[PDB]
Amino acid sequence: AKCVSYGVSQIKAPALHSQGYTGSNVKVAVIDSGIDSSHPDLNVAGGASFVPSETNPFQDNNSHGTHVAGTVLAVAPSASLYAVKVLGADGSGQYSWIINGIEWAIANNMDVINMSLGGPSGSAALKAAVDKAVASGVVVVAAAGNSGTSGSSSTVSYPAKYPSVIAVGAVDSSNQRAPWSSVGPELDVMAPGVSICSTLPGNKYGAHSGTCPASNHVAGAAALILSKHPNWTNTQVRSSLENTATKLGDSFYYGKGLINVEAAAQH
C-alpha cells in the first residue's frame, strides 16, 4: 500500500540521497514490456515501441516494466526513465525488436540502458548493438538470468553474457545468492532481487523476485553515480561499481559481490 524495497538501503543509496544526489538529469532506457506512466508515483520522460502489434510503450499488459521503473526510481528518484518496449504480451521479443530498442537508446543519448530481459542464445547483430552502445558511452546493465546453477556451465543469458555488459545476479536481505540466480564467469555483481516491492499497473504495489529487480538496482546506482560525477565515462561508472563491491562467495556464483553505490561514488 506504498512500500520502498529493503534493497535501496542494502546498496547504500541513502548515503547519496542525503548528499543530494538522486539521478537528476540521467537518461535511463528501460528496455522491457513498457511502463504504466498512469501510476502517480512514477515519472516517465518518454519512449518508443519496437513491438509491431503493440504501438503504446506506456501500456504495461504484463506488469514487468512498471515494476522495473519503480525499482530504478526507488534507487534514483529524479532519473528520467524512457519506456522502450521490445517485449510483447507473451513476454518475449525478436532480436530485431531488442536491437531496435538498443539503436534507439544510442540515437536519443540515453546515459544508461537497463535490460531486465534474457534468452539462452545470442546473435552477432545483438552483440554488435550492445557493444556499439558501450562504445558510444552508454552504461549497459542486464539481468544475469533466472536459470540457476547447472553443474560447471555458465547459465548467464544474453545479452548479460557479453563482456561489454554489466551482468547482475540476485541476493536476498542476507546477501545469500537466490537459488534461481544465473551463474558463470560472465556474472559481474549482485544486487537485491528477492521479494523486491515496487510499482505495478493501476496505482498498485507488490513484490516480484528475479535478476530483473537485481539489475534495476544497479541501473539506478549508475544514475546515482553520474548525478555526482556527470563527467565520468561508462568505463569509470562500471569500474566504480565492480571495484568497490562487497565480496561475498566465489565469483562464479556472486561475481565481485554486492554493489555499494556509496563506496562507488567516492572511487
Author numbering: 1 to 75, 85 to 276
How is this structure described in the published paper?
Thus, Oml-1 and other omniligase variants containing mutation F189W, which is crucial for the broad substrate scope, cannot be crystallized in crystal form A or B. Crystals of variants containing a Trp at position 189 were only found after a long incubation time for Pre-4 (Ptl-M222P/L217H/A225N/F189W) and Pre-5 (Ptl-M222P/L217H/A225N/F189W/N218D). The structures of Pre-4 and Pre-5 each contain three protein molecules in the asymmetric unit (molecules A-C). In both of these variants Trp189 is involved in intermolecular contacts which are different from those in Pre-1-Pre-3. Variants Pre-4 and Pre-5 crystallized in crystal form C containing three protein molecules (A, B and C) in the asymmetric unit. In this crystal form C, we also observed a crystallization artifact; part of the loop from Ile205 to His217 of molecule C is forcibly drawn into the active site of molecule B, mimicking a peptide substrate. This is an example of a crystallization artifact, and shows that ligases have a strong preference for binding a peptide in the active site even if it is their sibling. The second effect is due to F189W in the S2′ pocket, which serves as a strong binding force to drive the binding of substrates with hydrophobic residues at P2′.
Omniligase-1 is a broadly applicable enzyme for peptide bond formation between an activated acyl donor peptide and a non-protected acyl acceptor peptide. The enzyme is derived from an earlier subtilisin variant called peptiligase by several rounds of protein engineering aimed at increasing synthetic yields and substrate range. Mutation A225N in the S1′ pocket and F189W of the S2′ pocket increased the synthesis to hydrolysis (S/H) ratio and overall coupling efficiency, whereas the I107V mutation was added to S4 pocket to increase the reaction rate. The final omniligase variants appeared to have a very broad substrate range, coupling more than 250 peptides in a 400-member library of acyl acceptors, as indicated by a high-throughput FRET assay.
